[PDB]
Design a protein around this ligand. Structure first.
Ligand SMILES: *[C@@H]1O[C@H](CO)[C@@H](O)[C@H](O)[C@H]1NC(C)=O
Ligand SMILES: *[C@@H]1O[C@H](CO)[C@@H](O)[C@H](O)[C@H]1NC(C)=O
Ligand SMILES: *[C@@H]1O[C@H](CO)[C@@H](O)[C@H](O)[C@H]1NC(C)=O
Ligand SMILES: *[C@@H]1O[C@H](CO)[C@@H](O)[C@H](O)[C@H]1NC(C)=O
Ligand SMILES: *[C@@H]1O[C@H](CO)[C@@H](O)[C@H](O)[C@H]1NC(C)=O
Ligand SMILES: *[C@@H]1O[C@H](CO)[C@@H](O)[C@H](O)[C@H]1NC(C)=O
Ligand SMILES: *[C@@H]1O[C@H](CO)[C@@H](O)[C@H](O)[C@H]1NC(C)=O
Lengths: 201, 596
C-alpha cells in the first residue's frame, strides 16, 4: 500500500554534531519503514562494509530493532571498526562482536569537524585495565593507574588521564582527518519484527 | 605492573601528546617561513618554548624508569632517546651562558656585513653578495681581500666565544657520561644491545680514517688536475709542487669545488647537458617539475604525494607583498602532513632539488607508521643520502631523454661522461677531505688534543696535510677561521656529509644491482624498477626502529659503511685523470712553495 512513517535516518546521518568514540551515541530505531537503498546508493560514504548481511537484501528483510551507533574517529582507525580487530578504538572505546550482523558506514568529515586552531571536542579513551565487551560504553573519567602507587585522583607519576583529544585540523593527512562512523546493528528477537523494508505495490 | 609495561604506557601518553605539540610547533614554523611577520615570529617562539618545556618535563619524568629492566628493543630505544638530559644536566647559569653564546653566534653569522676599507658607505652581506663574489670572480687580490676581511671580522669576533663554547659543551658532555662533545656527536652512530650489529663511538673515527685512506688517491689526482688548471688561470701564484691557495677554490671556505667547473672543464668544445632551455621552450611550470618528480617516484613503486601536499605546499615564490625564506626545505609537520617549501625556478638545479626534496618527503612518509620518537633516519647520514640518490638518478641522460627534456638524438660519447663525472667529483669528491679534516679538528679540539694557543698552527697543518690547501698569509691565534662556516658556528654536526656521501653511492650500487643495470654506475637510472623501490622501501619503512647497520644490511648487504661504490662510480674519471697527470706531479708538498 501507500507507505509513510519513514525511519529517522536524517537525525543520525545528517546530525549537526556527533558524539565522541568513547561516549558513542546509540539510537534505537523501531516501528518504521527503513529504506536502505537511499543510504547504499549515496556517493557520500567512503566505507559501507556490511558484515553478516548483504546490502542488496537489506531493503527486503525485516528486523525487530535497529541500533544506530554514531561516533567520530580518525581515518586510520576506520579499519578497527570490524569484528575480530584490535587497536585502541576496539580495545578501549568501541568493540564489535565477532558474530556481528550489521553495517559499518564511515565518511570523511574534514569540512565540518576540523578547525584551523584545532578541534578538541572529540575524545578517545586511551587506557583501561581490561578490554571492552561488545556494545559496551565506558564514560568513566577516573585516573588510570599504570603503576603500584595509588593515583588518589591526581595525574602524577604513572597516573594518566584516560580520555585524550584528537586535535582535528583541516590540514591533516587523510589517515588523521575526522571520519564520522555510523554502525547499524540488526538483531532478530522473538518479539514481532517491526522495522521492515518498503514494499512495492 | 612491571617496569616495562609502565614505560610502554608512559611512551603511549608521551607519543600522543608529543605528536600534537610537535605539530603545533611545526605549523608555527611553517607559517613563519612562508610569511615573515612579527606575530608569526612571536607564535613560533611561543610554540617552540612550549615544545622545549614539554621535552624537558618528559625527560625529567622518563628517567625514573631504569633502562636495564626493559627488554623490548624499540621501547628501550625510545626511552634512551627521551632520557637524554641535553643541556639540562648543566647548571642554570652555565646553561643560560651557553644559550646566549649560541644565539649571539647565530646573530653574528647571520648579520655579518663586511666591505672594503676606505669605501664604507655600503656593504655586502655574505649570503646575498660574498657568495657570488667567491663563486664568480677571476681576480686574485679581490678574492684575497674578501677572504681575509671576512675571516678577520668573523674570526676576531668569534674566537673568545668559541673558546667559551668548547669548555661549556665539554662540561655538558662529561656531565652526560661522554668523554667530550665529540663523543656526544659520535653517539648518533652508537648501536648497543644488538647481537652482531653493535657499533661503537670509537669505531667511527677508525672507519672514517680507513675510508679516507682509500679516498686519498682519487682526491690526489683530482687535486693535481685542479692545480694545473688553476695554474693556467692564475699564472704565477700557484706552484707545481705546492698546495692550492685557499681563496681560489670557488667557495668561501672550500666546502665545494663546483664553481671551478668553467675553469677546469675537460672538453669545452663539446656541448653541455643543460636542459634549462628545453623546459623554457616547453613552458615547464614548477607544478610540472614536481609532477614529473612524482611520476619518477611512482615509476619505482613508491607511494605518490597526498592531496594535502599539493594543497598546502609553497612551490613558487609568493610575491613582493609576502616574504618567505628562499631555501628549499622538506617539512614533515606530523599527522600525515608533508609539505615542500621551495622557491622553484625553471633550472636544472631546481629540478634536481625538487627530486631531492621529494625524496626527503618519501623518506618521511615511509616511517609515518613508526612511533613519534622513532620517526627519524637510522642515523643522520641516511636522511640526506636518500635524497641524494634521487638527485643522482634524475641527473642521468637516460632520465632526461625518457621524460622528453633532452633530445633523443643527443650523442652520449665518452667526453661528455668525463666532464659530467668531473663536475660530480668537484661537487662530491672535493667536499670529502674538507669534511673529514673539519670533523677531525673539532674532535681534537673537544678531546683536548690541541691546546687553545695551538689551534690554528695545527689547523693549517691539518689543511696542508689532508686537504692540500695552503693559507695565503699566516694566521695567529687571534683569528677563528673554522667558525666562519654556518654549521660549526651554529652547533651542527658535520660528519653527516661524509657519511651521506658514502651511503649515497652504496645505496646507488644496491639499487642499480637490483634494477639490473648493465652499464657504468653513473649511467644508471632507477626508474621503472619495482624491485629497486621495494628494496629501498624496506629500509625506508624502518625509520629509527632498527640499527643503521641492520638498515645498511637491508639495502647493500654490508654491516658497515663502505668506500668501494664511490670509487667504482668515478672509475672512468679516475683512469682519465691518471692519463692526464703523466707530465704533472700528483700529490703536494706541505712547504710554503706557492705563497705565504
Ligand atoms: C544527508 O545530507 C545529504 C546532503 O544533502 C542528503 O543528500 C541526504 O539525503 C541526507 N540524508 C541522509 C539520510 O543521508
Ligand atoms: C601573510 O601575513 C599577512 C599579515 O598581515 C596576512 O594578512 C596574510 O593573509 C598572510 N598570507 C598567507 C598566505 O597566510
Ligand atoms: C615491542 O613493543 C612493540 C609495541 O610498542 C610491539 O609491537 C613489539 O612486538 C615489541 N617487541 C617485542 C620483542 O616484544
Ligand atoms: C640526567 O640528569 C640527572 C640529574 O643528575 C641524573 O640523575 C640522570 O641520571 C641523568 N640522565 C642520564 C641519562 O644521564
Ligand atoms: C595517488 O595514486 C592513487 C592510485 O594510483 C590515486 O587514486 C590517487 O588519486 C593519487 N593521488 C593523487 C593526489 O592524485
Ligand atoms: C673516447 O673514445 C675514442 C674512441 O674510442 C678515443 O679515441 C678517445 O681517446 C676517448 N676519449 C676519452 C677521454 O676516453
Ligand atoms: C618508464 O615507464 C613509462 C611508462 O611506460 C615509460 O614511458 C618510460 O619511458 C619508462 N622509462 C624508461 C627509462 O624507459
Amino acid at each position: 500500500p501507500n507507505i509513510t512513517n519513514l525511519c529517522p535516518f536524517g537525525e543520525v546521518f545528517n546530525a549537526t554534531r556527533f558524539a565522541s568514540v568513547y561516549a558513542w551515541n546509540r539510537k534505537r530505531i523501531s516501528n518504521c519503514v527503513a529504506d536502505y537503498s537511499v543510504l547504499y546508493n549515496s556517493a557520500s560514504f567512503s566505507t559501507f562494509k556490511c558484515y553478516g548481511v548483504s546490502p542488496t537484501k537489506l531493503n527486503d528483510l525485516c528486523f525487530t530493532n535497529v541500533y544506530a551507533d554514531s561516533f567520530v574517529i580518525r581515518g586510520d582507525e576506520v579499519r578497527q571498526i570490524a569484528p575480530g580487530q584490535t587497536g585502541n578504538i576496539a580495545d578501549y572505546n568501541y568493540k564489535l562482536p565477532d558474530d556481528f550482523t550489521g553495517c559499518v558506514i564511515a565518511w570523511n568529515s574534514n569540512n565540518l569537524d576540523s578547525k584551523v586552531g584545532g578541534n578538541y571536542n572529540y575524545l578517545y579513551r586511551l587506557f583501561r585495565k581490561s578490554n571492552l565487551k561488545p556494545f559496551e560504553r565506558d564514560i568513566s573519567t577516573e585516573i588510570y593507574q599504570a603503576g603500584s602507587t595509588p593515583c588518589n585522583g591526581v595525574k602524577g607519576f604513572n597516573c594518566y588521564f584516560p580520555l585524550q583529544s584528537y586535535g582535528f585540523q583541516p590540514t591533516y593527512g587523510v589517515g588523521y582527518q575526522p571520519y564520522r562512523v555510523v554502525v547499524l546493528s540488526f538483531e532478530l528477537l522473538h518479539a514481532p519484527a517491526t522495522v521492515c523494508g518498503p514494499k512495492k505495490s | 605492573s612491571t617496569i616495562e609495561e609502565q614505560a610502554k604506557t608512559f611512551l603511549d601518553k608521551f607519543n600522543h601528546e608529543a605528536e600534537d605539540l610537535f605539530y603545533q610547533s611545526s605549523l608555527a614554523s611553517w607559517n613563519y617561513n612562508t610569511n615573515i611577520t612579527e606575530e608569526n615570529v612571536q607564535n613560533m617562539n611561543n610554540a617552540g618554548d612550549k615544545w622545549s618545556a614539554f621535552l624537558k618535563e618528559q625527560s625529567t619524568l622518563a628517567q625514573m624508569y631504569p633502562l636495564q629492566e626493559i627488554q623490548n628493543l624499540t621501547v628501550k630505544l625510545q626511552l634512551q632517546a627521551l632520557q637524554q638530559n641535553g643541556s639540562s644536566v648543566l647548571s642554570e647559569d652555565k646553561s643560560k651562558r651557553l644559550n646566549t653564546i649560541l644565539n649571539t653566534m647565530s646573530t653574528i653569522y647571520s648579520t655579518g656585513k663586511v666591505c672594503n676599507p676606505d669605501n664604507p658607505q655600503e656593504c655586502l652581506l655574505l649570503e646575498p653578495g660574498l657568495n657570488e663574489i667567491m663563486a664568480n670572480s677571476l681576480d686574485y687580490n679581490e678574492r684575497l681581500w674578501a677572504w681575509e676581511s671576512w675571516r678577520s671580522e668573523v674570526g676576531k669576533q668569534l674566537r673568545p666565544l668559541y673558546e667559551e663554547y668548547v669548555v661549556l659543551k665539554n662540561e655538558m658532555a662529561r656531565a652526560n657520561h661522554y668523554e667530550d662533545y665529540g663523543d656526544y656527536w659520535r653517539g648518533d652512530y652508537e648501536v648497543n644491545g644488538v647481537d652482531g650489529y653493535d657499533y661503537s663511538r670509537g669505531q667511527l673515527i677508525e672507519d672514517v680514517e680507513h675510508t679516507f685512506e682509500e679516498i686519498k688517491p682519487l682526491y690526489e689526482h683530482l687535486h693535481a688536475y685542479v692545480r694545473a688548471k688553476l695554474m693556467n688561470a692564475y699564472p704565477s701564484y700557484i706552484s707545481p709542487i705546492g698546495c692550492l691557495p685557499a681563496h681560489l677554490l670557488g667557495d668561501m671556505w672550500g666546502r665545494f669545488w663546483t664553481n671551478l667547473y668553467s675553469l677546469t672543464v675537460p672538453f669545452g668544445q663539446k656541448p653541455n647537458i643543460d636542459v634549462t632551455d628545453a623546459m623554457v621552450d616547453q613552458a615547464w611550470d614548477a607544478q610540472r617539475i614536481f609532477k614529473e618528480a612524482e611520476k619518477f617516484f611512482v615509476s619505482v613503486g613508491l607511494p605518490n604525494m597526498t592531496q594535502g601536499f599539493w594543497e598546502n605546499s609553497m612551490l613558487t615564490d609568493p610575491g613582493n607583498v609576502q616574504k618567505a625564506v628562499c631555501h628549499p626545505t622538506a617539512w614533515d609537520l606530523g599527522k600525515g602532513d608533508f609539505r615542500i617549501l621551495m622557491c622553484t625556478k625553471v633550472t636544472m638545479d631546481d629540478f634536481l632539488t625538487a627530486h631531492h626534496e621529494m625524496g626527503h618527503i618519501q623518506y618521511d612518509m615511509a616511517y609515518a607508521a613508526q612511533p613519534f620518537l622513532l620517526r627519524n633516519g637510522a642515523n643522520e647520514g641516511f636522511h640526506e643520502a636518500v635524497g641524494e640518490i634521487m638527485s643522482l638518478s634524475a641527473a642521468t641522460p637516460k632520465h632526461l631523454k625518457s621524460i622528453g627534456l633532452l633530445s633523443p638524438d643527443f650523442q652520449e660519447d665518452n667526453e661528455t661522461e668525463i666532464n659530467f663525472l668531473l663536475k660530480q667529483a668537484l661537487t662530491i669528491v672535493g667536499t670529502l677531505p674538507f669534511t673529514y679534516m673539519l670533523e677531525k679538528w673539532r674532535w681534537m679540539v673537544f678531546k683536548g688534543e690541541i691546546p687553545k694557543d695551538q689551534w690554528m698552527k695545527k689547523w693549517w697543518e691539518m689543511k696542508r696535510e689532508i686537504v692540500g690547501v695552503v693559507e695565503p698569509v699566516p694566521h695567529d691565534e687571534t683569528y677563528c677561521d673554522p667558525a666562519s662556516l654556518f654549521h660549526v658556528s651554529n652547533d651542527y654536526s658535520f660528519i653527516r656529509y661524509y657519511t651521506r656521501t658514502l651511503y649515497q653511492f652504496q645505496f646507488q650500487e644496491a639499487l642499480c644491482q637490483a634494477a639490473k643495470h648493465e652499464g657504468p654506475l653513473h649511467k644508471c637510472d632507477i626508474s621503472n624498477s619495482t624491485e629497486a623501490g621495494q628494496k629501498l622501501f624496506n629500509m625506508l619503512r624502518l625509520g629509527k626502529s632498527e640499527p643503521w647497520t641492520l638498515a645498511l644490511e637491508n639495502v647493500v648487504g654490508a654491516k658497515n659503511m663502505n668506500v668501494r661504490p664511490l670509487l667504482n662510480y668515478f672509475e672512468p674519471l679516475f683512469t682519465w685523470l691518471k692519463d692526464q697527470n703523466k707530465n704533472s706531479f700528483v700529490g703536494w708538498s706541505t712547504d710554503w712553495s706557492p705563497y705565504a
